Design an enzyme around this catalytic site. Structure first.
Site, PDB file in Angstrom:
ATOM      1  CB  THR B   1      26.314   5.008  18.586  1.00  0.00           C
ATOM      2  OG1 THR B   1      24.874   6.177  18.533  1.00  0.00           O
ATOM      3  CG2 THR B   1      26.517   3.963  18.157  1.00  0.00           C
TER       4      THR B   1
HETATM    5  B1  LIG Z   1      25.067   6.635  17.646  1.00  0.00           B
HETATM    6  O1  LIG Z   1      24.323   7.450  19.192  1.00  0.00           O
HETATM    7  O2  LIG Z   1      26.235   7.694  17.791  1.00  0.00           O
HETATM    8  C1  LIG Z   1      23.427   7.166  17.106  1.00  0.00           C
HETATM    9  C2  LIG Z   1      24.447   6.246  15.495  1.00  0.00           C
HETATM   10  C3  LIG Z   1      23.368   6.165  14.622  1.00  0.00           C
HETATM   11  C4  LIG Z   1      23.871   5.794  13.132  1.00  0.00           C
HETATM   12  C5  LIG Z   1      23.388   6.273  12.546  1.00  0.00           C
HETATM   13  C6  LIG Z   1      21.718   5.536  12.042  1.00  0.00           C
HETATM   14  C7  LIG Z   1      21.533   5.461  13.277  1.00  0.00           C
HETATM   15  C8  LIG Z   1      19.868   6.128  13.479  1.00  0.00           C
HETATM   16  C9  LIG Z   1      19.055   6.452  12.143  1.00  0.00           C
HETATM   17  C10 LIG Z   1      22.456   6.186  14.603  1.00  0.00           C
HETATM   18  N1  LIG Z   1      23.705   8.770  16.153  1.00  0.00           N
HETATM   19  C11 LIG Z   1      22.472   9.293  16.820  1.00  0.00           C
HETATM   20  O3  LIG Z   1      21.601   8.833  17.906  1.00  0.00           O
HETATM   21  C12 LIG Z   1      22.397  10.596  16.705  1.00  0.00           C
HETATM   22  C13 LIG Z   1      22.219  11.601  17.928  1.00  0.00           C
HETATM   23  C14 LIG Z   1      23.809  11.333  19.036  1.00  0.00           C
HETATM   24  C15 LIG Z   1      24.583  11.236  18.341  1.00  0.00           C
HETATM   25  C16 LIG Z   1      26.226  11.533  18.906  1.00  0.00           C
HETATM   26  C17 LIG Z   1      26.286  11.133  20.146  1.00  0.00           C
HETATM   27  C18 LIG Z   1      25.011  10.762  20.801  1.00  0.00           C
HETATM   28  C19 LIG Z   1      23.900  11.183  20.009  1.00  0.00           C
HETATM   29  N2  LIG Z   1      21.086  10.345  15.781  1.00  0.00           N
HETATM   30  C20 LIG Z   1      21.347  11.794  15.543  1.00  0.00           C
HETATM   31  O4  LIG Z   1      21.846  12.004  14.933  1.00  0.00           O
HETATM   32  C21 LIG Z   1      19.394  11.992  15.086  1.00  0.00           C
HETATM   33  N3  LIG Z   1      18.431  11.036  15.405  1.00  0.00           N
HETATM   34  C22 LIG Z   1      17.230  11.005  14.420  1.00  0.00           C
HETATM   35  C23 LIG Z   1      16.556  11.876  14.432  1.00  0.00           C
HETATM   36  N4  LIG Z   1      17.719  13.674  14.806  1.00  0.00           N
HETATM   37  C24 LIG Z   1      19.064  13.092  14.200  1.00  0.00           C
END
Ligand SMILES: *[B]([O])([O])[C]([C]C1=[C][C]=[C]C([C][C])=[C]1)[N]C(=O)[C]([C]C1=[C][C]=[C][C]=[C]1)[N]C(=O)C1=N[C]=[C]N=[C]1
Ligand SMILES: *[B]([O])([O])[C]([C]C1=[C][C]=[C]C([C][C])=[C]1)[N]C(=O)[C]([C]C1=[C][C]=[C][C]=[C]1)[N]C(=O)C1=N[C]=[C]N=[C]1
Ligand SMILES: *[B]([O])([O])[C]([C]C1=[C][C]=[C]C([C][C])=[C]1)[N]C(=O)[C]([C]C1=[C][C]=[C][C]=[C]1)[N]C(=O)C1=N[C]=[C]N=[C]1
Ligand SMILES: *[B]([O])([O])[C]([C]C1=[C][C]=[C]C([C][C])=[C]1)[N]C(=O)[C]([C]C1=[C][C]=[C][C]=[C]1)[N]C(=O)C1=N[C]=[C]N=[C]1
Ligand code: NA
Ligand code: NA
Lengths: 203, 199, 196, 214, 204, 220, 213, 199, 197
Positions: B1
């Site tokens: 993100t």
């Molecule tokens: B981002 O990459 O930080 C994203 C931000 C976020 C916040 C609130 C709601 C959503 C979607 C519902 C997304 N978060 C993610 O993509 C994370 C993984 C992540 C975290 C930190 C750095 C890189 C990637 N996704 C999850 O935790 C998750 N999503 C789907 C299924 N399981 C878990």
């Protein structure tokens, strides 16, 4: 530590070592490893020093409180059972305490071995501590139920003396008590190396 | 993100990419990470999706009742403290960063950082995995006194620059312009992103 | 490490247990009794971890005694075995599980002689004969070989001696003496200790 | 807090004739990353006491909130009694020890400077409840770099003027900027005298890099 | 610790034109005492002795591998070794095993063969030489030994004064160590003679 | 340990403390940490005392073979390279942290060599557990092209700050000045602790110690 | 993982005499290879006839000290009398054992007068086991000073020696000489020696200097 | 560390910060990480100081003998392969990255990356801990056809931008311009660094 | 787990060893000999790990036998103990260390009776009496109590009987039979096995 106790014709002999150690350092050359609960009830100590002192002092408080309630002294069986129930409540907590509840009550002399696990054994001969095996060897060899009080004092004296010789966690002085029908008498508090030197000089 | 907020005269601009991942797998490629906390108060979500959504749901609830009791729109400082306290109380169990920005009658347009329960006002701020690769860029490109359009261009360029470099960032850039008049929602598609050196 | 054995006949239950109270490498006691009378016709033989055994066996004993006082009659060996199981199994997933392996021998006026085997996990099995401890590995096959359901008490005592003699010949642990008792229509009868 | 996030480095302190001076850079680091290069790590507690904090910034902000309120609380009474610098140091020791004993420490090492009844005060409190007073203090990496320079001067001349103390602190910040890889050339100098607490900033020490041409 | 498996203590002290070396006599495995007459001081010359504390197998091994090199040295050189040179021989012998060392911490006590000026030193388990002008200690009760030596040692001690000092510093140190004791042996090294004494010490 | 170096107008100054510690106990109150490599090259050692002792001994011996063969005074670059290539080969397992100072045909030079085999050419440096106390004094008051006594003073102060501030450092300040004309080994140049005095009454009257056995071997 | 303990060093020592008790300590406070402060005496006055020496983890030293201070006031209010040396020792054992599963990393040595006006020393381990002693050393240089106390104050290993009991003057000279030896060999002991003397007349404090390194 | 190299018409520009750390401690604050491998070939050092110096010492030795045998200055491709092979053969035991850049009669000014035993020619390249925060900056700021002076400002700006953000980077900036004519060495002091947003 | 004992008199060495060969919880053999004759006047009693014992003891035996054949005379108990020590200590830091605990008893025409103690680490000690195994914890103090250096062989057998009886009373291991042998001026003499039936 090396504690020992044995019943015989003239009562119960209870002898203790006096060493306290922290690793290989000797923290105390002389420590009292016998709690005089009352004129007819004693407790020997081995294991963790704080556990020994606190827990046996707690049994003593409960023994004293029993006398005030009933007007009679606690029996050796109730005092030993009391201590093992305290240990049982703290199972898995890491307490370390080996003791022998020695005394005299309405059923004659009494000797019990109590452990931090809640082991409670009645018997006529026990030995606790890091040097118990050495003490058992000397004690077993010269023990006969018909021993004189003075002959029993030598058996208890030598058993601890030889155990301090081989066990690095035993030394200092022997504190020996004789439990009679009208209470115990502290027989002696004798330096173990002076005894060992006396036995060496006799060869 | 990659999340970002910029203060200007009449308010704030907030931006985010659109990638939701689960390891090396893109789970959602068009997520809007700019979540409203009140009319004129928004937060940009990052970190654990479950933790970020939970904190946003609770903050919007607390702020809705707070606003109705004061018979007034909540202050952006109050909304920042609301998020901050939740993030701080639960910092050992939460793994999300919720940037808070918006507008007030009192202090106008303000941008706040909530990282791990802390609170800090910033002229502009960045967050998420993608922010690591655009620190030097935002440090060189930021100039004070930027217009709302210049803020949207700074936000779009910085987020596109991070999206290219970051595997956990990509998709589309969602833009939001909070002002006294209201909120404007823009979407910059993956086809319309600004172009820079990409080799 | 300790030894328990039971052989059930047509109208009696024969049980035996080692007499060693040991700690570390030393044999602290040669005359240690491991059987606990629960009722007039019920014995609970209990082996296991240092404190757990007396603590668990005595709690069951006192509750079986409270039943006798409360109701005027005693529990049956079946009800007493299932009550022992309910408590052991209830402590299993608790902070304080008991590491006790036990045998319950008894005689019921209606159902006859019964011998039960209980795991430290509290699995309850009714068996014609049973054994607990490392010694069971050397003696279950002797019992498999010579046990018959019509075995007289005099014959079961001989079969028990062969199992105890096998522990002297092959068992590395020094188990010198054993407590021997028979439960029948007239109650618990103490027999002579099998000594070596 | 079992694992700190944004952390502050050394906090300096030295008492002079008529007050105490405390110094701290305005940096919050996320590991090696200089993430916030303009956050204040010094706080005016009340008219006689001031606190500087090393370690986790979110935990410092929390203590700044808790202390700030305690002061407001006291001031509503208006009874002619106020927390001495020494009383704030005593409370803060009990606060750190209490959190440490619940196995949930506040990840900070703080320096408290004060001036009450003509006496200068300088006290140290860490995340475990270790507290003490000293003529000079230096937290973190400053205990290795700056404390030897403060003690070197205080050995020659134990009583320093406000100007000598101030120049000694500027010399120490210059060394810390050269040697501490978690420092920044932006700092604050807070001073407590008869007049009260005065926080100055942002300051920067001039650097010399002629050794590059050697 | 590996060094505490056998226990023991060794000490050396400088005097006027004399030098002393002492050690306890216990040989034990962990908390069990095996013998009360274990040798820890070995003669390397007429007026040169080495004391070895630590793991009993390496005390014996180092002393034997050192005697091998020493004998060859004196045969090729046609002279008795100088005390400083023996120290360098032990340092090189021990450092050869730098990344897998012998569990012994030697102490050397001798008189120079022309000046009869004392020499004391000690080596760590990887052979780091350390010469002192007062005393050297090595053992499980090194903390106790340092306390006794620091309090009792005086500069130009006569052989008789040196004997009382090293004896009292060993006895009182070892008496606060569970795995050291079973008697003490002391050698007084003078130009004219060696005097060996076993002290009447505690046996527990 | 607090070991330090300096490059002044006419050479190099090397400073060292005299404490050797064996796990919170001072084993030696006065050891020599400044070692000879060549007549105009000296080296300070800090870390595992046997590793500093032997790696300093080996390079000094290699520099004697170098100089005997070449017929010239050794260069400080040679001692730096011989040391680095040896330490690198041992992947930091030889725990010697060294400060090499000296003078050759190309002038005075000061180097820091670390246990893994990395090095830097510096105008001033400090190594050991007390390096930060010394490095603070050096940063605070170093100016290039200092005079002999100004550098000697700054060096003493740098080592002294470490002696007082570091528990792993103490004793006296040993120093070595190296100039085009050779090296002056200033042992115990400074003593920050005045001689410790006691009212020692620990005399034992002969016979107090109980003796069990006594054998006397006369010699010649 | 966070550790709630740190070792801040320092040495304490007490001697029980015929009509006096000495409790002494160094003033050094450290952590790792750093010195926190050079003026940190480990002696705490509890009553006009009881002093305590505390050494180990400074956080626990400060806490156990304030708790002891508070408990004496509570006892005075409840019993309308000051706690005797023996009652403070017996109480400290219960306070230390109250933390049997999360100990106070403190070595305590109480020193004062008994109900006969004689010297009393009580020594403790972090978990609460204690005993009355003639003398005792605790803290970082405990093992260096204890063998010399055993020898010079206990007359151990000395045959044909006149057992003269120690005087205040002679014990004060011994405390000054043992802390000089402790400061020479123990890195955690130094800067100054703070001595507390307890007599019928009350408490006096003396401060002699030790090595700054 | 932050290292950087940029190709231009008549050669290359290489830059580096000057920090040498050991944990949070600055060990040497003015170290020159631009090490010569031959008359018109240089390498920029990063990672383990002992590993980077060892590889550079060996590469310069191998290239000196190679050059004398071919009776010609070694090709920058040969110097890049020399460094790459050592870094590749010992990739499990080495933890250093040595960027290789310089000039040739044949291919002129070339920039090479050696990361973990790989080999790639780059129009410009960055390395070290500090490079992480300037990816988005170099992606936005790089334009082809830059003059040697433009390369020097680009290298100065990108390294200063990283130095501010990176705790493991700092000090002065060392610049080196390798051309047919020779090598130029510049030093931008900590006082003279370009200034950008630093709050 | 296993038991070795030695009592040295003025002109003899008395030794005894348990006869149990055990695997897991079973007593596989009741008549297992643990003594290895090295020379006419030397016995090596050896206990320890599963394979290590026979392997180590027999290697030393064949080398002591090779010395006899090579030189015409046998090793002295001292040279045979130091040779045993050199090999055990040399394998200590090797890939294949031997976990063996032993006693070497012997009689020399010049030095008299000698009893040596050696642990698996290869520390060598000359003792008037010694014991190996958990049993040594229960019997070293019985020997401390009654052993005298003028002990006649008849008396030493009553002392050894007191030690073996102690293992029956207190040792948790079943060790009911023991090999007994005396080494003197006339060599190795087999005595009756001390049994407990
Ligand atoms: B981002 O990459 O930080 C994203 C931000 C976020 C916040 C609130 C709601 C959503 C979607 C519902 C997304 N978060 C993610 O993509 C994370 C993984 C992540 C975290 C930190 C750095 C890189 C990637 N996704 C999850 O935790 C998750 N999503 C789907 C299924 N399981 C878990
Ligand atoms: B003994 O060795 O088992 C001994 C028992 C003991 C010690 C002191 C006081 C009493 C009764 C008042 C009993 N215990 C110790 O020596 C232990 C160490 C130990 C434990 C188990 C086996 C061997 C040794 N020492 C301590 O508990 C201790 N040591 C120093 C300070 N405080 C406590
Ligand atoms: B110094 O305090 O770091 C010191 C350096 C030293 C010591 C003695 C002699 C020389 C010259 C060859 C150098 N190091 C030590 O004292 C070390 C332990 C150490 C290591 C790292 C940091 C702090 C301390 N001590 C020894 O090696 C040693 N000690 C006693 C006896 N022999 C060796
Ligand atoms: B840089 O930060 O990566 C830097 C570059 C470098 C290359 C060759 C030679 C030197 C100086 C002699 C430095 N390397 C270092 O600072 C490293 C530590 C490092 C590595 C990776 C990221 C950040 C920092 N320095 C050392 O390894 C080191 N230096 C001195 C003493 N011990 C180790
Ligand atoms: Na002993
Ligand atoms: Na110091």
């Amino acid at each position: 530590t090396t504690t020992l106790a044995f019943k015989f014709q003239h009562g119960v002999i209870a002898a203790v070592d006096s060493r306290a150690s922290a690793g290989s350092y000797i923290s105390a050359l002389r420590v009292n490893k016998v709690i005089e609960i009352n004129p007819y009830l004693l407790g020997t100590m081995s294991g963790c020093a704080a556990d020994c002192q606190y827990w046996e002092r707690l049994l003593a408080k409960e023994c004293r409180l029993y006398y005030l309630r009933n007007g009679e002294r606690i029996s050796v069986s109730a005092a030993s059972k009391l201590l093992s129930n305290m240990m049982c409540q703290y199972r898995g907590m890491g307490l370390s305490m080996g003791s022998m509840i020695c005394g005299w009550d309405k059923k004659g002399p009494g000797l019990y071995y109590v452990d931090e696990h809640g082991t409670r054994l009645s018997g006529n001969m026990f030995s606790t501590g890091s040097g118990n095996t050495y003490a058992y060897g000397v004690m077993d060899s010269g023990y006969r139920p018909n021993l004189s009080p003075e002959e029993a004092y030598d058996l208890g004296r030598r058993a601890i003396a030889y155990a301090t010789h081989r066990d690095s966690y035993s030394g200092g002085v022997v504190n020996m008590y004789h439990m009679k029908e009208d209470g115990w008498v502290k027989v002696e508090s004798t330096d173990v190396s002076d005894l060992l030197h006396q036995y060496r000089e006799a060869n | 993100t990659t999340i970002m907020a910029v203060e200007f005269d009449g308010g704030v601009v907030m931006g985010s990419d659109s990638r939701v991942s689960a390891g090396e797998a893109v789970v959602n490629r068009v997520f809007d990470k700019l979540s409203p906390l009140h009319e004129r108060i928004y937060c940009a979500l990052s970190g654990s999706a479950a933790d970020a959504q939970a904190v946003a749901d609770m903050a919007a609830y607390q702020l809705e009742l707070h606003g109705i009791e004061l018979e007034e729109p909540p202050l952006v400082l109050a909304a920042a403290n609301v998020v901050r306290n939740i993030s701080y109380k639960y910092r050992e169990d939460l793994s999300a960063h919720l940037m808070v920005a918006g507008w007030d009658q009192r202090e106008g347009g303000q941008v706040y950082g909530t990282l791990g329960g802390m609170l800090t006002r910033q002229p502009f701020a960045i967050g998420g995995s993608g922010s690591t690769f655009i620190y030097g860029y935002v440090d060189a490109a930021y100039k004070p006194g930027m217009s709302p359009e210049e803020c949207r261009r700074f936000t779009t360029d910085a987020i596109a620059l991070a999206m290219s470099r970051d595997g956990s960032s990509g998709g589309v850039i969602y833009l939001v312009t909070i002002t006294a008049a209201g909120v404007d929602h823009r979407v910059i598609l993956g086809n319309e992103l600004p172009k820079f050196y990409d080799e | 490490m300790e030894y328990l054995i039971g052989i059930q006949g047509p109208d009696y239950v024969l049980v035996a247990s080692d007499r060693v109270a040991a700690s570390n490498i030393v044999q602290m006691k040669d005359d240690h009794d491991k059987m606990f009378k629960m009722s007039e016709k019920i014995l609970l033989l209990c082996v296991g971890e240092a404190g757990d055994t007396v603590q668990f066996a005595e709690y069951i004993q006192k509750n079986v005694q409270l039943y006798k006082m409360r109701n005027g009659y005693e529990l049956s060996p079946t009800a007493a075995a299932n009550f022992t199981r309910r408590n052991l199994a209830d402590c299993l997933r608790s902070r304080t599980p008991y590491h006790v392996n036990l045998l319950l021998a008894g005689y019921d006026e209606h159902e006859g002689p019964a011998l039960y085997y209980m795991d430290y996990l509290a699995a309850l099995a009714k068996a014609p004969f049973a054994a607990h401890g490392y010694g069971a590995f050397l003696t279950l096959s002797i019992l498999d070989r010579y046990y018959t359901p019509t075995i007289s008490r005099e014959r079961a005592v001989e079969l028990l001696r062969k199992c105890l003699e096998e522990l002297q010949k092959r068992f590395i642990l020094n188990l010198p003496t054993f407590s021997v008792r028979i439960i029948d229509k007239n109650g618990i009868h103490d027999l002579d200790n099998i000594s070596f | 807090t079992q694992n700190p996030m944004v952390t502050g480095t050394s906090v300096l302190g030295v008492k002079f004739e008529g007050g105490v001076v405390i110094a701290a850079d305005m940096l919050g680091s996320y590991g090696s990353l200089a993430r916030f290069r303009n956050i204040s790590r010094i706080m005016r507690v009340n008219n006689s006491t001031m606190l500087g904090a090393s370690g986790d910034y979110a935990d410092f902000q929390y203590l700044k909130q808790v202390l700030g309120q305690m002061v407001i609380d006291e001031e509503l009474l208006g009874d002619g009694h106020s927390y001495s610098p020494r009383a704030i140091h005593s409370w803060l020791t009990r606060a750190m020890y209490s959190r440490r004993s619940k196995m949930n420490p506040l990840w900070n090492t703080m320096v408290i400077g004060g001036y009450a009844d003509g006496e200068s005060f300088l006290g140290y409190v860490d995340m475990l409840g270790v507290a003490y007073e000293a003529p000079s203090l230096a937290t973190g990496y400053g205990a290795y770099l700056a404390q030897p320079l403060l003690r070197e001067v205080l050995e020659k001349q134990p009583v320093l003027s406000q100007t000598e103390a101030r120049d000694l602190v500027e010399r120490c910040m210059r060394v810390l900027y050269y040697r501490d890889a978690r420092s920044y050339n932006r700092f604050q100098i807070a001073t407590v005298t008869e007049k009260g607490v005065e926080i100055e900033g942002p300051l920067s020490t001039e650097t010399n890099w002629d050794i590059a041409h050697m | 610790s590996i060094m505490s498996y056998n226990g023991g203590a060794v000490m050396a002290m400088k005097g006027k034109n004399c030098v002393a070396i002492a050690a306890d006599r216990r040989f034990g495995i962990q908390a069990q005492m095996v013998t009360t007459d274990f040798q820890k001081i070995f003669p390397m010359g007429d007026r040169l002795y080495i004391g070895l504390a630590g793991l009993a197998t390496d005390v014996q091994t180092v002393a034997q591998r050192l005697k091998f090199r020493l004998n060859l040295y004196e045969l090729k050189e046609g002279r008795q070794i100088k005390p400083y040179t023996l120290m360098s021989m032990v340092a090189n012998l021990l450092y050869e095993k730098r990344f897998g060392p012998y569990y012994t911490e030697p102490v050397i006590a001798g008189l120079d063969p022309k000046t009869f000026k004392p020499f004391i030193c000690s080596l760590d388990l990887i052979g780091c030489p350390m010469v002192t002008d007062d005393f050297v200690v090595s053992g499980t009760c090194a903390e106790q030994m340092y306390g006794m030596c620091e309090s009792l040692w005086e500069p130009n001690m006569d052989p008789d004064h040196l004997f009382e000092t090293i004896s009292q510093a060993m006895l009182n140190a070892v008496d606060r160590d569970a795995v050291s004791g079973m008697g003490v042996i002391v050698h007084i090294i003078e130009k004219d003679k060696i005097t060996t004494r076993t002290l009447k010490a505690r046996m527990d | 340990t607090t070991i330090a170096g300096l490059v002044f107008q006419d050479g190099v100054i090397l400073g060292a403390d005299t404490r050797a510690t064996n796990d919170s106990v001072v084993a030696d109150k006065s050891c020599e940490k400044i070692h000879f490599i060549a007549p105009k090259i000296y080296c300070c050692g800090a870390g595992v005392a046997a590793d500093a002792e032997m790696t300093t001994r080996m390079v000094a011996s290699k520099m004697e073979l170098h100089a005997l063969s070449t017929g010239r005074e050794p260069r400080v670059a040679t001692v730096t390279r011989i040391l680095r290539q040896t330490l690198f080969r041992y992947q930091g397992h030889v725990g010697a942290s060294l400060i090499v100072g000296g003078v050759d045909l190309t002038g005075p030079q000061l180097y820091g060599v670390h246990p893994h085999g990395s090095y830097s050419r510096l105008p001033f440096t400090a190594l050991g557990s007390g390096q930060d106390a010394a490095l603070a004094v050096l940063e605070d008051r170093f100016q290039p092209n200092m005079t002999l006594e100004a550098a000697q003073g700054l060096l003493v102060e740098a080592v002294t700050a470490g002696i007082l501030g570091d528990l792993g450092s103490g004793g006296n300040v040993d120093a070595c000045v190296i100039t085009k004309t050779g090296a002056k080994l200033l042992r115990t140049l400074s003593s920050p602790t005045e001689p410790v005095k006691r009212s020692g009454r620990y005399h034992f009257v002969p016979g107090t110690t109980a003796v069990l056995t006594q054998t006397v071997k006369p010699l010649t | 993982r966070f550790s709630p303990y740190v070792f801040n060093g320092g040495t304490i020592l007490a001697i029980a005499g015929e009509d006096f008790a000495i409790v002494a300590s160094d003033t050094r406070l450290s952590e790792g290879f750093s010195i926190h402060t050079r003026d940190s005496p480990k002696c705490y006055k509890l009553t006009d006839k009881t002093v305590i020496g505390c050494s180990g983890f400074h956080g626990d030293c400060l806490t156990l000290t304030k708790i002891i201070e508070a408990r004496l006031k509570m006892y005075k209010h409840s019993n309308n009398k000051a706690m005797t040396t023996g009652a403070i020792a017996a109480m400290l054992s219960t306070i230390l054992y109250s933390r049997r599963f999360f100990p106070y990393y403190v070595y305590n040595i109480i020193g004062g007068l008994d109900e006969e006006g004689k010297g009393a020393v009580y020594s403790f381990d972090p978990v609460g086991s204690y005993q009355r002693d003639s003398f005792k050393a605790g803290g970082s240089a405990s093992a260096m000073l204890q063998p010399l106390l055993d020898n010079q104050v206990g007359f151990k290993n000395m045959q044909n020696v006149e057992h003269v009991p120690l005087s205040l003057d002679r014990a004060m000279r011994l405390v000054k000489d043992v802390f000089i030896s402790a400061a020479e060999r123990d890195v955690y002991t130094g800067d100054a020696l703070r001595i507390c003397i307890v007599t019928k007349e009350g408490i006096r404090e003396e401060t002699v200097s030790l090595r700054k390194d």
